[PDB]
Design a binder for this molecule. Structure first.
Ligand SMILES: Nc1nc2c(ncn2[C@@H]2O[C@H](COP(=O)(O)OP(=O)(O)OP(=O)(O)O)[C@@H](O)[C@H]2O)c(=O)[nH]1
Lengths: 440, 238, 246, 642, 135
RNA sequence: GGAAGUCGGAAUCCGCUAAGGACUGUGUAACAACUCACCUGCCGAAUGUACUAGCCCUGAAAAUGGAUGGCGCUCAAGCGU
RNA sequence: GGGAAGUCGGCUCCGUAACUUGGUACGGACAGGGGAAUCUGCGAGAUUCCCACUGUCCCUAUCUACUAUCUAGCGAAACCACAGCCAAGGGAACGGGCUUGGCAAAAUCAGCGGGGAAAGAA
RNA sequence: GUCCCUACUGAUGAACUCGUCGCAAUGGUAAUUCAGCUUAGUACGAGAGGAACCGCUGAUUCAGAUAAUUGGUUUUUG
């Protein structure tokens, strides 16, 4: 569902201040030398144990709130590795855990020392020593706290990508129209600017196609390099293109108005097809209104066609400024994804044994419509006023009055008093609002 | 929202229409606020505030002096890391299964012999309430000292030993107790008090002697109050 | 037309409403949002009566009727009965019935030609229903659920039945009635169709939690909105139903 | 309130075989009961019941008992423990004794165990005059007085009830010569340990003692060492010896994909048919889990999936337990989900598939659960799901079994029966099943609540489970570092491997990417991050085979019936009050002849014991009441009956 | 979200904490054992109690072993102790009875045996739908 | 990838000078833009940095209602001579 | 008597026929009672509910014992330096009388839950 | 091995002729938390989700009363 529920991670000074303020403010702080040595020992031992407990809770809360990278989906694990340097992330969490254990050991040692203390001064010195040691360990855990707070904030701002749903991954070089298409098909605010790398992260939008919800992932943008010197941005791009089963929309600009050569575009597509091993690939040609496909030399034209003549990569054309083919390309890709998913669900339901699954039986029952055997229908008593009516809209000047508007004018929801006799259809209209006798 | 959305909102719509003026006036009012805080708030909070202000003023004065000088103008960690890395190598890749056990404590022994002996003489148990060093675990003490009980919670085995000339502090095991300058009974019992000579294993330091050998034991003086501080601190006499 | 609405904050519109082809009954409470959505969908074509039965807001699950008649339990007071009589035209016959199963909206489903009842109703109640509603009365258990009024919603165009009803029983019910039937759910997986939806020949009101695929099933089977057609479920919406309710 | 009120009902099943540190005119060795020379009436008792061939438990224990040696027996349920110690009952007693006193005592944890013991006792003592009694809570305590006066020679009892009656009687147990603790493992699990210890103190030193169990917890081992005289410990043949006909596979899967992996292993590998099946079935799969909440969640999820599922957990209603085990033994179900202790309790048929959903803490527990199957030479499959946290336990298992451990596809044809093979599942339909699990959890609220409860239980088990060894942890770290952890498992096909090592190479190249700088570097926070990254930056056969010394081998409080803590010796005097009602004389002292008058007064009913016994007179008839005359007649008849 | 009903008027409470009642639905449970009530106010030495329409937590004392496994929520339907309805009518039922419901307010069973409390039917729409007699 | 003084490492010079840092902050994706350092004009006479000494505020307090003895006292009815 | 708490509680034999004295097949019987109710016309009458154990707790019931305001009459004893309102202060863990303050109005009745009692120290 | 004064809480009261109607120094002092409806599926949000001010209606605890009704109680010994 997200990672916005991770509690804020304090700095070292804030951590020390919180722990010490709690240990002084939630406990009594007046012991006298004239009290029993056992009572003095109990007082100081209680102070040492409280400080440690507050610490272990806040350390355990930190350790348990942050996601564990192993148990996440491969996409999430790889994206977190790209974004936060997973190894150093784990090192920081391990330091938090080791500090927790060391503070626990300090508490046990000083509790035994307070057990065998003999004076109020000695007990005071032992308590001060234990508290100062804990503060020293936190002051050591200064920097990991800063790093973890930054990771927590970034994680709370990260988008929600469900790895296994109906997904449309729009990818390609910068300056091609990826974000333009994303805002055309979804209401996600993806920055659109004339420069090169305006999209510095993965963006998520959503759409509805034949009563189904579809995810659309805008990738930042990939350059034509071998995969070993790619930046973290295009590494997020390739991670999304690698671990997300979906329909890939690879965008190209036939016009060189993007700033990269067509030959390099086909080269990168060939390079990242092994990424696109089975996920369904549609090549979208954009800025046709700047230069359509026909206005191109035929060696490039046959190069594109030879790209088509392999697997099931499909060519479509569109323009994200005139809004010409965006609806058609969306419709086509969503329809093909839907039919593929329905076919694979049917094959999964039809097992080798031949026994029809319970859920497939249920869906067959839900799609089956039963009709009378005789084939005769029933008479329908729909009046004529309904087809003589006008559909209600909240924006028409001379609309219908409506009881909401009447009560809002004559008070509110708890103040308007309804006349239950206003619709009484009697013989004489003046007999309304009459007190009908009940007892005589 | 899914990215730096507050930054996007800033770029698209701006700030509140008087935020710059409010921030400037608050920053200008900060001086009176600081004086009011110094003169009004009271009780451990004023103490923390005063300590913080002292630290800030010292840092600012140091920065000013260093900047004036620079505008006019036109190892112990290493030895400790070497020692720790050697220890990690040995303990990680020369550690082999060995029958590793320990004897029972003098408290357990005393409880057992007390179950054996009904009539408890009043005060027959005196507990040594000072930190001690023992060495072995299941030792039988002479009848001279058999009733001195030294608890596990008070026993110490390692000390933070500082080499002055090779300026570095390392954690080293304690080999023996040579002289407690307060009591011969304490130096017999291994009581660790302030200014107490102990024998420390200095093998990890790699100190070269005159003949060319590595020192395996030196004298170190305990220079803290281990009864008040839950640690033993020694300075090496070299 | 199919519209999504909530009574107060509840998605069960069938509990608080009773829609027929000549009148609508609306539970009375606090605001006028529920009455107002019903009125905006029925702009004085048929009367709408703000009514209470036995001092309750469950009028939808307590009353059963069609355009020819209305039946209310014996617990209904004379004042509420007189309110209903004054509010409704004389072409609709209203009666109180002395049935032990006073949950009339739970024990009776009736279109304008047939009624299907809880098997344990009394004989006298059976002739009373057949006379006032002017329908052929049959006793049947829908999906082994004995409360047909809660687990099926019916109109003269079609009828939507409990999601876990067998195909044989669905076919038998379709033959016995004369309208298409489909096994579907309302309010995002709820089985209480009658309590979660009121439907007449040209209007349906469901809860706000009704999903888009199942709202399209409702519009299709009850022929609400342009072409509709029970058959479109089997032709144009299969992919949707299979992908959504797998 | 009772959401984990006291504890998870199945806690753990600890076992320790280090309890074995306790120590032609001449028919030749026919292994017969007559060959061990039982008396004629006993032999005809066997001839009627129909146990023709002795079970190994009987063959190994009966002669030692006849030699009168203290016995500690290890067997799984259904082996024949109850007959194995009840044949010596009558074989030793041979007759009823007129002298007052009991001679045989059997202690059973629960009433149903006492009842099964009672039937084995009666249909073996058919013919003899021995008196056998049953003492459990809930029975009429006055009837228990009456039976104690009736003087049984054999007493089968629940320890708490027996303790209460002994304290109420001041019984002289010196006449008892035989003591049996039947399932002392469950005795200690239920916590009767103090009661058992003080009962053992009450019994005289001169007795012969048997203790029968499936496992040997450390507490049981200490109890036997403290209370048994030179105990001989017997095993039922080979539980430790893993069957060579067992082929095992281990699947590295994540916590968020456990359910998907289980659905995958059922659907694709085991090829499980769905629906009610048309003596086990052909598929016969058991699923061993950790917690009762895990059992609930998995059983409900599989039932939603459509599988024929039976569940047995620790604190299950006994009638439901019988129903589920009956379905499993008769083949009405194919899935049987148990944690550990329900499986220990129930008698499991021969199985074809064993699935370990939660990896065992002990290799010994693993060996037990896998020796459950692949018996009598039949082939068996054992699939186990392993996480990164369960990996050190897997390596401990590898060391225990002495098997070579292969990762992914390091070998073209690894031996599933001789090697420990670890691999990954097929990602495509694994993700399909994971999506199914996510959808069903998001749709159904009850299963979502079950998932939350079992997640909390899993956290508790992780906190309270016995950790592994340091070397196992280090080897877990190194194998996680190694490539074989993430590779596809061997059972899925070499062609599948072809596509896998075709595609995964640059997927591995993505996974093993080291960023040059984080997003925060792309302020004081940035400076701290940079400094900390800079700090963490990477750091720059000669053995005589014959005689080389190796480092490795080769007032006390007791819980009463009311549940409130009660003093161990609390004579409420209700036995005094008992003979005050019954006007009886002094009870027969141990050794005197039985009193036939006392037996006739309190011996037994005429057979079946009917629970309902409540006689009230009817209410007084009212003239205005309809049935006045008949109610008056009924009242008069009740008055005559008195 | 705590299962505290809204808008409920005062009635005399008839089922306290630690109280055995019948189960009115076909879920397989026979009796319920109220251990806790929702919306209770903790005052010293008072045992909390619930009236018709209040959500409670109960353990199935006898019935289906699947249900005899966990503490289930339940809305109590019938109350033997008399109470007053605002029409001035003091009334009571033959026994004390409730139905298993999820925290949202949806029943595990599919039918209710016996009549339903009017307050419970008004407060929980699902009970009103699965009820056959309402008084 | 982009880094133009201002995400980062190191040097940190010269001209024009009245003076202007290979830059002290705001800012841009990178610029641009503003501002500071420094300089000039108007203004006009004393300022400003650190310390020291008095008096004053803070520099820690629990728990019946109370105590410079009490009232009360402020160019004292307080402090120094 | 009722409520509550905990529980692991609720829901084969006789005769007959062959076989070696005992088993084998066949035929028949077995595997409840009590109380409280509801429904159809006492009715094979039909349907619903409750039956447990406990060295646990509480309440109701019975018995035992002490339990009592005023009036007429009769009529003690214990105990008694003198007294009796508080807060702060009164160096000796000391206040009841002293300092300086709060205050403070005859004579009584009843209730009573505070004070007018306590250490001695290794 | 050491029934009395007073505090508090209520009730009477002499003298100022009896009485009726008042004033108010001083002392005490009281309400509390939650929920539901509307706002509103609104603002906000890619999605999942999702408030608040005014207005309205109930409930917990606390406090002070009251007995029309509804239980309980019976020496009405009816
Ligand atoms: N005329 C025209 N310009 C287009 C079209 N699509 C995109 N652009 C231009 O492309 C630039 C924006 O690119 P985006 O739409 O954000 O696409 P992107 O691939 O994310 O590219 P970057 O902005 O470089 O990250 C602007 O200059 C747009 O005007 C199109 O169909 N027609």
């Amino acid at each position: 569902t997200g990672w916005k529920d991770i509690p804020p991670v304090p700095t070292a000074q804030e951590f020390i201040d919180i722990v010490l303020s709690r240990t002084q403010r939630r406990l009594p702080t007046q012991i006298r030398p004239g009290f029993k040595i056992s009572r003095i020992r109990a007082f100081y031992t209680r102070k040492v144990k409280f400080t440690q407990e507050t610490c272990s809770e806040k350390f355990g809360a930190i350790i348990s709130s942050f996601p564990v990278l192993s148990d996440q989906h491969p996409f999430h694990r790889d994206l977190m590795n790209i974004l936060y340097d997973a190894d150093h992330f784990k090192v920081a969490l391990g330091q938090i855990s080791t500090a927790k254990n060391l503070i626990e050991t300090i508490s046990r040692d000083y509790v035994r020392l307070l057990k065998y203390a003999q004076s109020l001064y000695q007990c005071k010195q032992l308590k001060r020593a234990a508290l100062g040691r804990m503060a020293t360990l936190i002051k050591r855990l200064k920097d990991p706290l800063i790093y973890l707070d930054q990771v927590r904030q970034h994680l709370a701002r990260l988008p929600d990508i469900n790895p296994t749903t109906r997904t449309l991954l729009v990818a390609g070089f910068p300056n091609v129209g990826k974000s333009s298409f994303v805002r055309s098909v979804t209401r996600a605010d993806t920055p659109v600017e004339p420069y090169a790398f305006t999209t510095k992260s993965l963006f998520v939008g959503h759409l509805d196609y034949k009563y189904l919800r579809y995810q659309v992932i805008d990738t930042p943008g990939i350059l034509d390099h071998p995969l070993e010197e790619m930046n973290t941005i295009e590494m997020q791009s390739v991670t999304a293109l690698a671990h997300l089963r979906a329909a890939v929309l690879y965008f190209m600009d036939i016009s060189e108005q993007c700033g990269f050569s067509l030959k390099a575009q086909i080269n990168l597509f060939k390079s990242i097809k092994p990424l696109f091993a089975n996920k369904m690939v549609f090549i979208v040609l954009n800025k046709m209104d700047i230069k359509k496909f026909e206005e191109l030399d035929p060696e490039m034209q046959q190069e594109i066609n030879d790209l088509t003549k392999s697997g099931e990569v499909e060519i479509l054309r569109a323009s994200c400024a005139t809004q010409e083919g965006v609806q058609e390309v969306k419709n086509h890709v969503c329809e093909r994804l839907l039919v593929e998913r329905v076919s694979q669900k049917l094959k999964a339901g039809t097992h080798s044994n031949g026994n029809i699954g319970t859920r497939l039986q249920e869906v067959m029952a839900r799609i089956h419509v039963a009709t009378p055997m005789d084939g005769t229908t029933r008479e329908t008593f729909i009046p004529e006023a309904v087809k003589n009516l006008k559909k209600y809209d909240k924006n028409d000047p001379n609309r219908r009055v409506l009881a909401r508007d009447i009560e809002e004018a004559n008070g509110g929801a708890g103040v308007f008093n309804v006349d239950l006799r206003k619709d009484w259809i009697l013989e004489n209209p003046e007999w309304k609002y009459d007190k009908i006798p009940e007892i005589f | 929202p899914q990215n730096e959305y507050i930054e996007r909102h800033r770029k698209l719509h701006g700030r509140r229409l008087d935020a710059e003026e409010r921030a400037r006036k608050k920053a200008a009012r900060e001086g009176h606020k600081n004086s009011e805080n110094a003169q009004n708030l009271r009780g451990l909070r004023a103490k923390l505030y005063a300590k913080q202000r002292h630290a800030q003023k010292i840092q600012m004065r140091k920065a000013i002096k260093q900047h004036e000088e620079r505008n006019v103008k036109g190892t112990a960690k290493a030895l400790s890391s070497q020692i720790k890395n050697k220890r990690a190598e040995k303990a990680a890749r020369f550690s082999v299964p060995i029958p590793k056990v320990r004897g029972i404590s003098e408290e357990e022994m005393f409880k057992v012999v007390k179950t054996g002996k009904k009539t408890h003489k009043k005060g027959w148990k005196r507990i040594v309430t000072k930190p001690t060093f023992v060495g072995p675990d299941f030792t039988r003490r002479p009848v001279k000292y058999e009733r001195f009980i030294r608890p596990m919670g008070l026993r110490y085995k390692k000390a933070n030993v500082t080499h002055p000339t090779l300026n570095v502090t390392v954690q080293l095991p304690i080999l023996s107790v040579k002289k407690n300058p307060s009591n011969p009974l304490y130096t017999q019992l291994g009581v660790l008090t302030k200014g107490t000579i102990i024998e420390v294993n200095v093998s990890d330091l790699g100190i070269v002697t005159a003949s060319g050998k590595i020192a395996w034991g030196r004298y170190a003086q305990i220079t803290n109050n281990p009864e008040n501080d839950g640690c033993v601190n020694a300075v090496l006499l070299v | 037309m199919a519209v999504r609405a909530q009574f107060e904050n509840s998605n069960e519109v069938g509990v608080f409403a009773t829609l027929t082809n000549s009148y609508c009954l609306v539970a009375l409470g606090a605001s006028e949002n529920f009455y107002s959505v019903f009125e905006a969908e029925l702009q004085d074509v048929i009367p709408i009566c703000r009514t209470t039965i036995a001092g309750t807001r469950i009028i939808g699950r307590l009353t059963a009727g069609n355009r020819k008649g209305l039946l209310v339990p014996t617990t209904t007071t004379d004042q509420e009965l007189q309110h209903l009589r004054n509010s409704l035209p004389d072409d609709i016959r209203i009666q109180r019935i002395e049935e032990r199963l006073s949950a009339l909206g739970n024990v009776i489903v009736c279109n304008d030609h047939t009624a299907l009842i809880h098997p344990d109703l009394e004989r006298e109640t059976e002739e009373i229903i057949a006379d006032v509603l002017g329908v052929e009365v049959f006793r049947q258990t829908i999906a082994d659920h004995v409360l047909v009024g809660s687990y099926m919603a019916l109109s003269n165009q079609g009828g939507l039945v409990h999601p876990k009803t067998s195909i044989q029983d669905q076919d038998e019910l379709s033959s016995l009635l004369g309208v298409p039937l489909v096994a579907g759910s309302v309010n995002r997986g709820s089985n209480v169709i009658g309590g979660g939806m009121v439907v007449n020949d040209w209007l349906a009101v469901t809860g706000l939690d009704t999903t888009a695929p199942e709202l399209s099933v409702i519009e299709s089977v009850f022929r609400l909105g342009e072409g509709a057609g029970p058959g479109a479920i089997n032709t144009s919406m299969k992919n949707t139903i299979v992908e959504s309710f797998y | 309130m009772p959401k984990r009120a006291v504890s998870p009902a199945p806690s753990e099943n600890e076992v320790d075989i280090a309890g074995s540190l306790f120590a032609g005119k001449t028919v030749k060795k026919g292994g017969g009961f007559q060959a061990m020379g039982l008396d004629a009436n006993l032999l005809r008792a066997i001839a009627r019941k129909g146990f023709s061939v002795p079970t190994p438990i009987q063959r190994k224990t009966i002669p030692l008992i006849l030699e009168r040696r203290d016995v500690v027996g290890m067997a799984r349920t259904g082996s024949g423990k109850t007959a194995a110690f009840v044949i010596p009952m009558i074989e030793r007693l041979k007759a009823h004794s007129a002298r007052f006193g009991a001679r045989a005592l059997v202690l059973s944890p629960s009433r149903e165990l006492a009842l099964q013991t009672l039937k084995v006792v009666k249909e073996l003592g058919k013919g003899t005059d021995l008196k056998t009694v049953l003492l459990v809570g809930g029975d009429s305590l006055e009837e228990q007085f009456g039976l104690m006066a009736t003087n049984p020679d054999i007493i089968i009892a629940t320890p708490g009830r027996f303790l209460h009656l002994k304290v109420e009687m001041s019984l002289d147990l010196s006449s008892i010569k035989y003591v049996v603790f039947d399932e002392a493992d469950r005795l200690f699990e239920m916590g009767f340990a103090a009661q058992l210890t003080e009962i053992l103190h009450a019994l005289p030193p001169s007795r012969q003692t048997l203790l029968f169990s499936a496992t040997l917890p450390s507490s049981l081992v200490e109890f036997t060492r403290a209370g048994l005289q030179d105990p001989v410990l017997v095993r039922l043949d080979a539980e430790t010896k893993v069957s060579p006909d067992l082929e095992s596979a281990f699947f590295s899967v994540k916590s968020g994909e456990k359910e998907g992996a289980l659905l995958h292993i059922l659907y694709d590998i085991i090829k499980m048919p769905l629906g009610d099946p048309p003596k086990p079935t052909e598929h016969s799969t058991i699923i061993f889990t950790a917690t009762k909440h895990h059992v609930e969640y998995i059983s409900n999820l599989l039932r939603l999936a459509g599988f024929s599922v039976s569940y047995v957990y620790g604190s299950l209603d006994q009638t439901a337990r019988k129903i589920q085990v009956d379905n499993f033994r008769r083949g009405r179900t194919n899935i049987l989900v148990v944690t550990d202790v329900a499986a220990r309790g129930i008698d499991i048929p021969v199985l074809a598939n064993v699935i370990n959903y939660d990896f065992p803490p002990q290799p010994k527990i693993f060996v037990h659960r896998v020796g459950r199957t692949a018996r009598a030479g039949q082939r068996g499959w054992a699939y186990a799901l392993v996480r990164e946290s369960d990996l050190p336990y897997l390596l401990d298992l590898q060391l225990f079994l002495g098997r070579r451990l292969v990762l992914g596809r390091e070998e073209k044809d690894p031996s599933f029966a001789r090697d420990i093979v670890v691999g990954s599942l097929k990602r495509v339909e694994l993700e399909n099943n994971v999506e199914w699990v996510n959808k069903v959890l998001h749709e159904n609220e009850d299963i979502g609540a079950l998932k939350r409860v079992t997640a909390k239980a899993e956290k508790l088990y992780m906190k309270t489970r016995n950790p592994a060894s340091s070397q196992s942890a280090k080897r877990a770290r190194e194998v996680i570092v190694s490539k074989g952890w993430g590779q596809l498992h061997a059972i899925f096909g070499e062609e599948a491997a072809n596509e896998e090592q075709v595609r995964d190479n640059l997927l591995s190249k993505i996974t093993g990417y080291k960023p040059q700088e984080t997003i925060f570097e792309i302020n004081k926070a940035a400076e701290a991050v940079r400094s900390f990254r800079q700090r963490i930056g990477p750091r720059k056969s000669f053995a005589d085979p014959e005689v080389y010394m190796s480092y490795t081998p080769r007032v006390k409080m007791i819980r009463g019936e009311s549940g409130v803590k009660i003093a161990a010796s609390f004579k409420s005097g209700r036995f005094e009050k008992w003979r005050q009602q019954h006007r009886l004389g002094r009870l027969p002292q141990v050794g005197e002849m039985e009193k036939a008058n006392l037996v006739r007064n309190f011996s037994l009913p005429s057979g079946p014991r009917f629970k309902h016994k409540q006689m009230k007179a009817p209410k007084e008839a009212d003239k205005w009441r309809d049935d006045y005359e008949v109610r008056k007649k009924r009242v008069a008849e009740a008055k005559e009956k008195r | 979200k705590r299962g505290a009903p809204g808008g409920k008027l005062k009635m005399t409470l008839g089922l306290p904490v630690g109280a055995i009642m019948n189960c009115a639905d076909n879920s397989g449970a026979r009796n319920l054992y109220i251990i806790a009530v929702k919306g209770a106010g903790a005052r010293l030495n008072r045992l909390p109690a619930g009236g018709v329409g209040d959500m409670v937590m109960a353990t199935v004392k006898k019935g289906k072993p699947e249900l005899r496994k966990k503490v289930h929520p339940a809305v109590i339907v019938r109350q033997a102790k008399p109470w007053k309805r605002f029409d001035g009518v003091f009334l009571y039922f033959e026994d004390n009875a409730g139905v298993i419901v999820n925290p949202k307010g949806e029943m595990k069973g599919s039918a209710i045996t016996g009549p339903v409390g009017k307050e419970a039917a008004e407060l929980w729409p699902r009970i009103a739908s699965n009820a056959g007699v309402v008084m």
